[PDB]
Amino acid sequence: SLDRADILYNIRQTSRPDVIPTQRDRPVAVSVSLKFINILEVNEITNEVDVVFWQQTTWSDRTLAWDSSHSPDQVSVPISSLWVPDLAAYNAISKPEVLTPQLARVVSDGEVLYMPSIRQRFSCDVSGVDTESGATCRIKIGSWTHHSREISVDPTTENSDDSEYFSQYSRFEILDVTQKKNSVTYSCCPEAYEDVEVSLNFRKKGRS
Amino acid sequence: SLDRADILYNIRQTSRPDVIPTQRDRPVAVSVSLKFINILEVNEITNEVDVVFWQQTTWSDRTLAWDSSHSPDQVSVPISSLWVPDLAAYNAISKPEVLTPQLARVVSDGEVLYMPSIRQRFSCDVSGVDTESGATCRIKIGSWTHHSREISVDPTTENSDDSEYFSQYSRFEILDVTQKKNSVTYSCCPEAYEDVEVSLNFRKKGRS
Amino acid sequence: SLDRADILYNIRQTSRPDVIPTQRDRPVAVSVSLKFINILEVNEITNEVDVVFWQQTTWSDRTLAWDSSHSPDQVSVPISSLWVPDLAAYNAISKPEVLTPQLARVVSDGEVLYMPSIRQRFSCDVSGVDTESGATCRIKIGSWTHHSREISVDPTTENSDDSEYFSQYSRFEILDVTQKKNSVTYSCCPEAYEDVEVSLNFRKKGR
Amino acid sequence: SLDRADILYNIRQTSRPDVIPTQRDRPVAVSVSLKFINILEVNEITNEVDVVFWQQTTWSDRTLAWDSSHSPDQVSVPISSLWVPDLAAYNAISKPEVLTPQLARVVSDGEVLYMPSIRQRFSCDVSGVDTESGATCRIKIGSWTHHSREISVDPTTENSDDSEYFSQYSRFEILDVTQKKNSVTYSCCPEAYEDVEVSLNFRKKGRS
Amino acid sequence: SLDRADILYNIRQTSRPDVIPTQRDRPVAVSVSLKFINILEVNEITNEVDVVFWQQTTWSDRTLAWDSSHSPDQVSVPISSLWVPDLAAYNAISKPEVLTPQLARVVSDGEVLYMPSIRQRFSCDVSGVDTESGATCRIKIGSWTHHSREISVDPTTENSDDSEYFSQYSRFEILDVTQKKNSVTYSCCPEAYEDVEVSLNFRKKGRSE
Ligand SMILES: CN/C(=N\[N+](=O)[O-])NC[C@@H]1CCOC1
Ligand SMILES: CN/C(=N\[N+](=O)[O-])NC[C@@H]1CCOC1
Ligand SMILES: CN/C(=N\[N+](=O)[O-])NC[C@@H]1CCOC1
Ligand SMILES: CN/C(=N\[N+](=O)[O-])NC[C@@H]1CCOC1
Ligand SMILES: CN/C(=N\[N+](=O)[O-])NC[C@@H]1CCOC1
């Protein structure tokens, strides 16, 4: 039997945080799912939104796996000990302000879950925010330097209510969230980069 | 007679900052109590408030214990040398600004006390703040990555006064403070994550 | 049958982050290209703009090279493990805010592509911004400490399109972007500092 | 012989940054003295000020001492290489913005002098700011984790001018400064933390 | 038989970044010159100014010196790998925001040039900014912890053009910059601290008559 200290030690022995854990020459399947918590500061003039969301990020790194027979099957681990996907919001206009402890969960099979609460500002369509049908702000997230042969990005469609963790005290409300998968090619390169496009359909709440 | 240096060096060689100090496979029992020192930058339209609180945080790591018959029975220790609970306010919308030195006290029996002064912005019900009944702003605080089997969160056992350390110079006054245990399951997982929900009943001082 | 872990391990052994990778006494040929993504704030009175651009930067560090005949020919690498050109915008009035992960792409032949997305404020000519012919804001980017014999700077004057990646949600639009080679030289010293002058010809949308 | 390089070397290898340098079992005598440099922003509605002060801070760490018969008797040392008292402003509402290089001065006897320029925001009484009487903003500075038996806090006895280095360009002027020894105690515990109360008596300057 | 990597490796082992390289009993002669590039927010009610400037900082460190017979006689070196004067603006009300790569130039005789673009806010006399004769904002720069006998600050005696690099797109224009020298003794300590006073005389462009 190993304790949590032994597991963490074994992870720091086999984890190479600067090396993508591809198996075969297959891409690492990264899942990304936003859970919007708040919409803080909207500007229809400048098409800018300030949003708080939980970024559900899962992937597998088999280098972290251990025997969990008579031992715990999960640990919390600082992300600086692990390879993490180099996700970027393509239409972000501020750095991500990470509000939560920078720890990820690692399961004994090597499945990793990182879920930071992030506050960030985006350039996106705010038109119609004060109308009844709302604005639809599209947020694009994928790897910054890993193309499709290295990272696949995919949404996990089991939306635990679009507006489930969303603050009831926002001035805004969510009408709909659709998370569609997408790709882009840049003439720099022959390569394509996978992204999740997250469409946030929201509006200012009416008054009685 | 061990001196403070000896006490510290023992802690350094034993403490594991990235390893939760569970006993057997029981949860680490963490205690959290917010002393409110100030309410600032209130906004009833956006439902947002800055708060300054001392976040009293107690837990035990019995491996750190020493005999304090002919030696000091407490030392100040930088938190970077200790495991510290990965606490987070679930309805924070800014990262905590830690106003005080990041030092904890380790007692010779293995009890640890970290009490940082934190300024932080929250999304919560600010309605009625200028009325007599006041507003009730609920702050949730618990482990981000450790479920109920790994970390338990409990309010401090005693009900000390609400405005005891509260700036007399604030534009607001506290009417009542209420700390209640709580526990949520999330879409990610079947396990539950414990929190203390602090209910801050406060209002603007009457013009007197 | 080398792998990504080998490639990185070898980079760690050969790479000198603080040492300019000049061959002989020939300058490190650095290529710079700004791709404008957004223009966020413009001030017609103060002559200041807040912009978002991808700064596509390429150079060669031959010490990084490896045989990729039976292994990957490219890896993503943190810039802390590489030497990076000490580029600065001469007319910037804020620190560069790097929005993206700080990883460069390294090719097996030693070629490096670093492409940060950067938000930054600049002091430049905003006159004309509210007219059809628009304003012309020039950004000067070159090495801060390495002269012409040490670093050379050149645009990637390809068939590069202006608004290809530019946000349609900006209140401004790009009319044209020309990136021309230049050299500043500062009164004191017989040392010329090469730069790219990026002329951003833009206007506010609407009548 | 024994040049500055040797002195820095010995400091670096003798210093214990995380261990208080208590001579025998008596508190570390810390001296604190704010010299006000500016009052930037003030708000009489919110009872908040933004001030700039040099924090003259002296104490002794005897282990650092060296023989300066044939060598220098004073060196500048980065505080990161030194034990430094864990001072906090109890009524601070912002992190101390240190404006100067983080170097202290070490004397061959072991006396350390650290004097950072700090810009910081405080919650204090601002009422009267635009009268002849003026306002009196009290600032409390003591150790955050070390009680009376570990750290003692005294104002420096120097009878210096109160406006001496204060900016003539500030919108405000200082009528008087009083720096007074005090302690604070909490209902949790019997231990007392010593502090200086600094009483800033200032007002808005007239055009006349 | 020596390249740039060799020069850096040798600097690393000779260089003591936390040791001022005083020679014998002399102070280290630091010379300081501000090349004003921009003047941003100005507030006359509050007497505060936001300024961008290149802080031309030069000094000698013979520990760094090497033989440049068959090697480069100058390298760019990160400032963390060498000793740097602990300069401070006395009347600054914000941390210096360094806009450029933090690299210094080292010549093989051990002469060091370090010249960050700095953006920083100051408390100084802004009254007059919207007048013909303009405002004069004084910026005092000197060592924070080294006294006259350890560091000396003297203004670059070069007869510089004041607005040589000053943005033509600024709202302000520079009338004059003058750099004097001072030696102040405070209340903590018996020794004197050298400073350069930089008087920046400037005003708004495009005023009437
Ligand atoms: C976002 N655009 C992009 N390329 N491009 O536009 O030519 N990404 C791939 C780059 C490879 C290194 O980091 C980014
Ligand atoms: C200042 N307040 C205090 N107790 N209290 O407020 O009840 N003790 C010192 C704390 C010990 C750990 O960090 C600070
Ligand atoms: C708060 N949300 C949560 N799950 N969820 O929202 O689906 N779990 C906690 C996460 C476990 C790993 O990092 C944090
Ligand atoms: C600049 N001011 C000064 N004294 N004073 O103002 O009373 N001495 C230098 C101090 C020595 C260590 O930190 C700074
Ligand atoms: C770019 N500017 C320059 N001269 N100048 O501005 O007067 N030389 C390079 C300097 C070498 C050290 O830091 C910058």
Longest pairwise C-alpha distance within chain D: 62
Q: In chain A, how many domains are there? A: 1
State which residues form the domain around C53.
4-14+25-204
Q: How far apart are CA A94 and CA B94, in angstroms?
A: 14
Method: X-ray
Q: How far apart are CA C74 and CA C109, in angstroms?
A: 9
Note whether A198 and A179 are within 8 A (CB).
yes
Q: DSSP code of E129?
A: T
Q: How far apart are CA E38 and CA D59, in angstroms?
A: 42
Note whether C79 and C114 are within 8 A (CB).
yes
Which residues 88-107 of B are in CB contact (within 8 Å) with D? Answer: 97-101, 103-105
Q: What's the gap in Å between the CA of C158 and the closest CA on chain E?
A: 28
Of C87, C18, C83, nearest in space to C53 by CA: C87
Q: How far apart are CA A61 and CA A109, in angstroms?
A: 8
Residue C20 lies in a domain: no
Q: How far apart are CA C118 and CA C96, in angstroms?
A: 6
Residue B11 touches chain D, beta carbons under 8 Å: no
Note whether A47 and A123 are within 8 A (CB).
yes
C155 alpha carbon to ligand 5 midpoint, in Å? 21
Q: The tokens of D62 are what? A: 């005897």
Of D166, D185, D186, D168, nearest in space to D176 by CA: D166
We report the CATH number of the domain holding residue B84 as 2.70.170.10
Q: Three-state SS for E158? A: coil
Q: C19, C45, C61, C146: which to substitute to probe chain E, counting the most E Cβ within 10 Å?
A: C19
Task: For residue C80, report the phi and psi dihedrals to the nearest 5 degrees.
Answer: -70, -20
Cβ(B190) – ligand 3 distance below 6 Å? no
Number of Cβ within a 10 Å radius of residue D201 = 17
Residue C196 lies in a domain: yes
Contacts of B104 by beta carbon, 8 Å cutoff, 6+ apart: B76, B77, B78, B79, B82, B84, B112, B113, B114, D145
Residue C47 touches chain E, beta carbons under 8 Å: yes
Half-sphere exposure of D122 (CA within 13 A, CB side): 25
Q: How far apart are CA E89 and CA E100, in angstroms?
A: 19
How many residues does the structure list for chain D? Answer: 208
Task: Give A-chain residues touching B186 at CB under 8 angstroms.
Answer: 160
Residue C147 lies in a domain: yes
For D20, name the nearest residue in chain B, comparing CA atoms only: B4
Residue E149 lies in a domain: yes
Contacts of C154 by beta carbon, 8 Å cutoff, 6+ apart: C29, C30, C31, C32, C181, C194, C196
Contacts of B172 by beta carbon, 8 Å cutoff, 6+ apart: B39, B42, B129, B202, B203, B204, B205
Q: E94, E188, E191: which to substitute to probe chain D, counting the most D Cβ within 10 Å?
A: E188
Cβ contacts from D onto E, under 8 A: 71
Task: Give D-chain residues touching E126 at CB under 8 angstroms.
Answer: 169
Note whether C83 and C17 are within 8 A (CB).
yes
Q: How far apart are CA B152 and CA B147, in angstroms?
A: 8
Q: DSSP code of B92?
A: B
β-bridge pairing A192-204 and B97-98 = unpaired
**Backbone angle region of E139, left / alpha / beta, with phi > 0 → left and psi within -120 to 50 → alpha:** beta
CA A201 to chain centre: 18
